[PDB]
Ligand binder design. Structure first.
Ligand SMILES: Nc1nc2c(ncn2[C@@H]2O[C@H](COP(=O)(O)OP(=O)(O)OP(=O)(O)O)[C@@H](O)[C@H]2O)c(=O)[nH]1
Ligand SMILES: Nc1nc2c(ncn2[C@@H]2O[C@H](COP(=O)(O)OP(=O)(O)OP(=O)(O)O)[C@@H](O)[C@H]2O)c(=O)[nH]1
Ligand SMILES: COc1cc2c(c(OC)c1OC)-c1ccc(OC)c(=O)cc1[C@@H](NC(=O)CS)CC2
Ligand SMILES: COc1cc2c(c(OC)c1OC)-c1ccc(OC)c(=O)cc1[C@@H](NC(=O)CS)CC2
Ligand SMILES: Nc1nc2c(ncn2[C@@H]2O[C@H](COP(=O)(O)OP(=O)(O)O)[C@@H](O)[C@H]2O)c(=O)[nH]1
Ligand SMILES: Nc1nc2c(ncn2[C@@H]2O[C@H](COP(=O)(O)OP(=O)(O)O)[C@@H](O)[C@H]2O)c(=O)[nH]1
Ligand SMILES: [Mg+2]
Ligand SMILES: [Mg+2]
Ligand SMILES: [Mg+2]
Lengths: 419, 421, 124, 427, 419
């Protein structure tokens, strides 16, 4: 029915910025101006992602948050910099963090209200608010710590509506901080409690896709974001476009998450880099093509949701889609009936004549949580860099309490490879 | 005398949208407004217009909005189209409790606004989805309350039993079991329509590789037309509800008759004996299953068009000679035959052609319970792990109501089987 | 043959005479009883006074049927009108309680942050 | 001296309707009223013109009586001697004797007493009624009971019509006959039975009518009756007194039913033929084919014979006719009883109805015999009754009006007895 | 002496309507107007079936009852529609039934009084009321249920007079409802108790006569009524015509019904469809020509009553009538003497130069009661469609109480094939 979009912390801001300019050109929107493009559809549900202001203008329902100016002015003087509403930006000024604590307590709390009070304006402006979606990183802190806070404070003011996040889980390769595992674990715990669905974009997976399968040597933060950015458009398509489903985003939740513990989705895309259909499915169901460092093999799928794109015959899709869960019919939990649903839309993405994307609630995701909990208990062992948080006000046992909650999540996913 | 139609939720709405259009074409009412008998379903409003005795309700606009858009826009009153902003979410628990409560009073009151210009109302025909948000939830609640405000007055439901391919939702089986429980002690007779059976007929017959909703609905439209028809034309077959049901249901347990449509054949004359012969053919049912297995405890034949009983008889005779009669122990050999001379008109740009004569056959078999099983299994197997139950407990439902409902389906499946010889 | 007849009476337009042929050779209605008649009245009036006291009998079982009918209906309404209402009270209380337990835990891992930021005042 | 006629119920009415007409013709009384004592026996010289009968007609529905106050003879009676009753007898003694009777008995009883009041020394009543048949059995029985209360001595002479399959009866008929003939028996002095089969029969062999009407039968019965009364209407020996009627025919209190045989019955058209000999008509009197109750006395015995002649006849012949009627015939007289033959001649010739089917005749005979063979008819009836009662066949209709199942036994019980008495008189 | 005629429920109304227009043209009566026809008799006993009003006009002594308008307006805008007295029609408006209960309790009782109080005005108008005759069906309910009620209420107000009915007993072929056996049994019981004579017009018999012996394929309700309608005129002739019998209708009762249990007559007609005498009798005494599905062979006759018609010599009739109960003299109970009476009238019916009709109290009728009790106990076994009645207020044991009474009726008729 209508969604607001919070976007916070260097990674989040950059990630979402590409998202925005990517869907904007899908809908045919200028840096400010409105429509331009012989298509007609687009506008039906443009409502959903764009509160529209004075005259023509389209301005996205987006809130921009950070704890240091730079990253924001990167957007303003950038791609679709002019597009966002001016007093929708919320600067930080003070020290960033790159330490959870700072963002979820001290330098964080400081801002919260001034952001919360702007989401409050956007929301109450909405004719019928569907929920919020936020982009941020789990490592570092100006969005992994303020973010998990922002959401802890959205529920309470909005228990009602649902919480959606795209969270980049960090890795040992392509990382700026030794502490990431601390920041990661500390958030994972928070996400588990106050969100309905969370998409995992693993940076380990991400790097692997660029170099391990794309000849791209030094992977910028750039061609890497291009992956996430394309994936994110694929994942939302059905809520921003046709008249096939409609996607209550709550329907999406009620149908993808069998168990309360908000289960985390691993996404996957069809063609890539900066397509026969049988060729498209074979790829979209391949580990070598997941957005999270996992491998659905070492684990069953709870429920899967796939969404195609471009002029192609569903007759073939429904056929191939059955042919996957057959040549692989052991990897689809049999205690949940028609647990794999496919949606087709006919408006091609950027370049690409054909395209597909994939959403998967798979117990293999366990693998991901295990590997961050591996460098965590591997450092929190002989209390590592911990004194950086102790100092900002946190308690020693708030770490064990997080670690403990997290391992259960592994001990639950591993419980559902049952029968 | 009179007769209110209620269409709740997407499927409900769209189905009715298509059979209110076949109605108009049958009685020749130019969308705009005008052209008893025809009065059973319409109220001669204004000094021109003809308007339906219907109410459409959905918990999101979308669907209803297209109705107030495409022609037929003029056909209804703005009031009979109720819409609700916030969606049903796909879980009975929401439609029946949370989100419903808010719109029930406004619907309930408007349908009474309709029943007020009806000297001696008859009952309601209600169209709704089996699984599906408000189709299961709101419906159930409506029926509970309709029973409170309308004591005697019969309730005839037209339910849509869900099927894997014409896309369902993972939670569908919960919803179906759920509604069909509460809803059962409140309906008089219900007509189930398997989406797989209709998808199926559109393939073997119309020859469509990808059957649309708009493609399915058209066909369902026809089945429904032939069902009501009798009480719209008027002096023919199953007159005044009551004598309609008094004909099919022998037991209070709301019995769901099995419907079989005559000749379905694509545009771009079939013998009286032949279409009857096609009526005792599984491939042409409305609920995928087979009665060469179970038994029959009341058969009905509803013909339409050019037909003299002289043949209908000789067609029955030979329809028993080399066939699976299999009638049940304590019940005659029914065959309340009804002919409705008025020919079967079909939609203009439709996929089916005009036909000289068509049959309907409504039978209450024990084999229809084969569908109550196919659903229980899905439900039972998911519930085995509280699969999605938490979403329902979330809106405010008891884990007990899940037991208590499947508990009835265990019972029903027993009763059905118990009627056998 | 050989008869000899004697003649008793000779009128104006008549004459009677007997003719013996052969020597033969040998050697209170009660009035009161109209009570018999008016015993039948009080037996027929019985017969009918019966298949009447026996007919108005059927009559007040017709009242009983029209009655177990309307009262059959009542106890469907005023039993399943409050089967709904006292279940949509099970509902409000349940969710309101589910949504009140969901803030209870939330306003506290909130009032802990506040109370352990006031720990950074004594700390740093 | 005087003499009241009572006609109850259809058959009764219509029979009298036809013999009151033969009476008029016999005494020459133009319908309306007068002629331009003797016959005072039967009429009361009313007004200073009219001649009017001493009769009363009663039926429980109008219909029949209504046709009397219509056709000529309309003037002949008084409006009050014609009593009628709106609601029918229904065809079951039980109604006539109890239910529907009671209501009209007091009005009849009183009117017949209104007639007996202008009669210096009344003689008795001649009553005409059907045997089976609604009010014929029922009301009659009740009338007689009460007539015995109000008229102690005065004799009662009934003229009963014994029913027969062909001249349409009613299934229940036999019940009704037995029923009435029981109550009614201890109250009558002498009764004249008339078998409808016998009369239907005479109309065939003689008048030659393929389909004999009631109006055809009655005319004939008229004649037999005329000949019976006659004696006491013209005055001239033999039965010039109701008492003398029983004294001559009934030897036993058991109301004995004499057997009547009418002389020459011959159709007009054959009218201008040859006058039948005095010897011949007597000879036709001892002939079964000419009786009034189908049976035969060549079988049983005679215990009192009577010859009633009418017309041109001298005793001299009546004698020689008797002589030869004994010679080559079945005399068979009974043990302890003379050889009766109280002969009566009534010079006044036998007049017949004008458009009638029988012709004028020079001389006619009557013969009233009390035989034991008349009980052959009491048998024929019992069998029918007995065989139906063997299953309470229709009894419930009678219990319905208020009768006892016992009265059915108690009545057949008498008929068992009578049939015994009859047979017991044999040698 | 004078009779009123109640006519209720679609079948009854249709059946009687043909009766009326059939006798009316016998007597020579216009849609409204009076006499027209060189005959003279007619008028004697016209009294019996016609209370006559203003000016000339004849208007039958008829009451019209139903629980749904339609069927009545079918008569009004039909054959002799104008003939009946306007406020003599008694509409129902509400639901019909086709369920006894509704007509003998709920929707029934509702009307009763308004009808009862119109029969009351016709009756008390009568100079000397003979009794009532009603036409209705035993299957279905707006006349089998209200009807049996109407009569239960006529006795009570008129113990006095007698109750006469022509009741169409239904069959498995040519039937609209599965429940008929329930409706039939439920009335049969009632008829047994409050009527003096009932004529059975079996529809099974009826259909058989049209197709089994008259080449008529699809038998309408029309040419089927034509049979009943002709039969009904034959049965009444003697009370509406001559001056041979007169017929107290009570005399007819006292003479045809030997046993209290109102014994049901099977009627039969001579020539048919829409004639030497020996040829006429041979036919009128044939099973193939009875109006009830029976066969006097499988049973003796208690009493029989036949009524001829047309200029023919009784000499022959009395002769042939004796010749039947001779070549068949074993089939006439010998414990009831002259138990077969014949009446002749000389005014020909419709078309037909010669005609005869037959009324028979025969223990073979047992066969008919047995066959409806066969489908009854065959359904009431595992309590069939019963809940349709339970619901309208009836008790479970009121069914057993009816079934029980009915089987006795068979066990009594079967008792009188004695000796
Ligand atoms: N035959 C038929 N089935 C339909 C149609 N639309 C939806 N369905 C089916 O209906 C079920 C889902 O019901 P919905 O109408 O979508 O549920 P709803 O809550 O009533 O409507 P929403 O508020 O839009 O969710 C599934 O079984 C679908 O296959 C239709 O137009 N025709
Ligand atoms: N001989 C003769 N017999 C008749 C005549 N009328 C009727 N009967 C016979 O009388 C018997 C029936 O008696 P009804 O006079 O009809 O009986 P009822 O009750 O007195 O007369 P209703 O009150 O009119 O019924 C049958 O045996 C008939 O054959 C008649 O005119 N002459
Ligand atoms: C965001 O938009 C989406 C919204 C939804 C679905 C979905 O996945 C295909 C989406 O794309 C990511 C969806 C999901 C899941 C199901 O079970 C796995 C289902 O049955 C069904 C669905 C979608 N509905 C249908 O397929 C209805 S026929 C509706 C909810
Ligand atoms: C409606 O008019 C009828 C009325 C009656 C009779 C009848 O014949 C069947 C009628 O025709 C239908 C009748 C009946 C039957 C008898 O027993 C079988 C009988 O003895 C006698 C009769 C009729 N009476 C007679 O035949 C004596 S002549 C009177 C009753
Ligand atoms: N793919 C994606 N990941 C990023 C990007 N920038 C940082 N990351 C990852 O996210 C983690 C923290 O991001 P950062 O923005 O520096 O944290 P912040 O202080 O909360 O804004 C790092 O450890 C990186 O692994 C980005 O541009 N795109
Ligand atoms: N023969 C005769 N029978 C009929 C007619 N109509 C209906 N019936 C029979 O009567 C039964 C029900 O009577 P119906 O009039 O429909 O019920 P109602 O509502 O009580 O009047 C059916 O089973 C029919 O067989 C008719 O037109 N003529
Ligand atoms: Mg929904
Ligand atoms: Mg009588
Ligand atoms: Mg009907």
């Amino acid at each position: 029915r209508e969604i607001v979009h919070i976007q916070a912390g260097q990674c989040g801001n950059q990630i979402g910025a590409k998202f925005w300019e990517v869907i904007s050109d899908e809908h045919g929107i200028d840096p400010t101006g409105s429509y331009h493009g012989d298509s007609d559809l687009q506008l039906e549900r443009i409502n959903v992602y764009y509160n529209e202001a004075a005259g023509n203008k389209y301005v996205p329902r987006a809130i921009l948050v950070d704890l240091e100016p730079g990253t924001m002015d990167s957007v303003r003087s950038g791609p679709f910099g002019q597009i966002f509403r001016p007093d929708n930006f919320v600067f930080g000024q003070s020290g960033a963090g790159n330490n959870w604590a700072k963002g979820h307590y001290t330098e964080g709390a400081e801002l919260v209200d001034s952001v919360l009070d702007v989401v409050r304006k956007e929301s109450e402006s909405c004719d019928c608010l569907q929920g919020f979606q936020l982009t941020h990183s789990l490592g570092g802190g100006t969005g992994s710590g303020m973010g998990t806070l922002l959401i802890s404070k959205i529920r309470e003011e909005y228990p009602d509506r649902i919480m959606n996040t795209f969270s980049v889980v960090p890795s040992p390769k392509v990382s700026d901080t030794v502490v990431e595992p601390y920041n990661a674990t500390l958030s994972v715990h928070q996400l588990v409690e106050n969100t309905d669905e969370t998409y995992c974009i693993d940076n380990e997976a991400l790097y692997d896709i660029c170099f391990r399968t794309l000849k791209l040597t030094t992977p910028t933060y750039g061609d890497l974001n291009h992956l996430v950015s394309a994936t994110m458009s694929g994942v939302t398509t059905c809520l921003r476009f046709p008249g096939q489903l409609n996607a209550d985003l709550r329907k999406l939740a009620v149908n993808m998450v069998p168990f309360p513990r908000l289960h985390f989705f691993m996404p996957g895309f069809a063609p890539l880099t900066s397509l026969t259909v049988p060729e498209l499915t074979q790829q979209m169901f391949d580990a070598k093509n997941m957005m999270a460092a996992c491998d659905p093999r070492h684990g069953r799928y709870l429920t899967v949701a796939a969404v195609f794109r471009g002029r192609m015959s569903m007759k073939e899709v429904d056929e191939q889609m059955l042919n996957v869960q057959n040549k692989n019919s052991s990897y689809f939990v049999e205690w949940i009936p028609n647990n794999v649903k496919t949606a087709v839309c006919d408006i091609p993405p950027r370049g690409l004549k054909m395209s597909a994307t994939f959403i998967g609630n798979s117990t293999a995701i366990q693998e991901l949580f295990k590997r961050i909990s591996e460098q965590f208990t591997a450092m929190f062992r002989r209390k590592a860099f911990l004194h950086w948080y102790t100092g900002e006000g946190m308690d020693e046992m708030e770490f064990t309490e997080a670690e403990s909650n997290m391992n259960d999540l592994v001990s639950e996913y591993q419980q559902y490879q049952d029968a | 005398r009179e007769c209110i139609s209620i269409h709740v939720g997407q499927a409900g709405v769209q189905i009715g949208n298509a059979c209110w259009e076949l109605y108009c074409l049958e009685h020749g009412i130019q969308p705009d407004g005008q052209m008893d008998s025809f009065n059973t379903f319409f109220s001669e409003t204004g000094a021109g217009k003809h308007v339906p005795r219907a109410v459409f309700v959905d918990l999101e606009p979308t669907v209803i909005d297209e109705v107030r858009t495409g022609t037929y826009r003029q056909l209804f009153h703005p009031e009979q189209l109720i819409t609700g902003k916030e969606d049903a979410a796909n879980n009975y628990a929401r439609g029946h409790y949370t989100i419903g409560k808010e719109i029930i009073d406004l619907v309930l009151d408007r349908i009474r606004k309709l029943a007020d210009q009806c000297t001696g109302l008859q009952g309601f025909s209600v169209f709704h989805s089996f699984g599906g948000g408000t189709g299961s939830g709101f419906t159930s609640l409506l029926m509970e309350r309709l029973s409170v405000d309308y004591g005697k007055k019969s309730k005839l439901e037209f339910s849509i039993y869900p099927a894997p391919q014409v896309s369902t939702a993972v939670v569908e089986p919960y919803n179906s079991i759920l509604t069909t429980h509460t809803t059962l002690e409140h309906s008089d007779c219900a007509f189930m329509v398997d989406n797989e059976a209709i998808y199926d007929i559109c393939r073997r017959n119309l020859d469509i590789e990808r059957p649309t909703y708009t493609n399915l609905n058209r066909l369902i439209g026809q089945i429904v037309s032939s069902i009501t028809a009798s009480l719209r034309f008027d002096g023919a077959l199953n007159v005044d509800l009551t004598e309609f049901q008094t004909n099919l249901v022998p037991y209070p347990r709301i019995h769901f008759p099995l419907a079989t449509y005559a000749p379905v054949i694509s545009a771009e004359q079939l013998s009286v004996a032949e279409i009857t012969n096609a009526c005792f053919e599984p491939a042409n049912q409305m609920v995928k299953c087979d009665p060469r297995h179970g038994k029959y405890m009341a058969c009905c034949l509803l013909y339409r068009g050019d037909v003299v009983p002289k043949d209908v008889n000789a067609a029955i005779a030979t329809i028993k000679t080399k066939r699976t009669i299999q009638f049940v122990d304590w019940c005659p050999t029914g065959f309340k035959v009804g002919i409705n001379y008025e020919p079967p008109t079909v939609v203009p740009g439709g996929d089916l052609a005009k036909v000289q004569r068509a049959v309907c056959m409504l039978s209450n078999t024990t084999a229809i319970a084969e569908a109550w099983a196919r659903l229980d299994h899905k439900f039972d197997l998911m519930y085995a792990k509280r699969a999605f139950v938490h979403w329902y407990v979330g809106e405010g439902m008891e884990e007990g109501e899940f037991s208590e409902a499947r508990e009835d389906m265990a019972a029903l499946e027993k009763d059905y089987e118990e009627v056998g010889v | 043959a050989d008869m000899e007849v004697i003649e008793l009476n000779k009128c104006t337009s008549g004459q009677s005479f007997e003719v013996i042929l052969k020597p033969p050779s040998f050697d209170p209605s009660l009035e009161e009883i109209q009570k018999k008649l008016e015993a039948a009245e009080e037996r027929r009036k019985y017969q009918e006074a019966e298949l009447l006291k026996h007919l108005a009998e059927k009559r007040e079982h017709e009242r009983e049927v029209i009655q177990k009918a309307i009262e059959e209906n009542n106890n469907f309404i005023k039993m399943a009108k409050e089967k709904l209402a006292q279940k949509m009270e099970s509902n409000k209380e349940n969710r309101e309680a589910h949504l009140a337990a969901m803030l209870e835990r939330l306003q506290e891992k909130d009032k802990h942050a506040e109370e352990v930021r006031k720990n950074k005042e004594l700390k740093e």
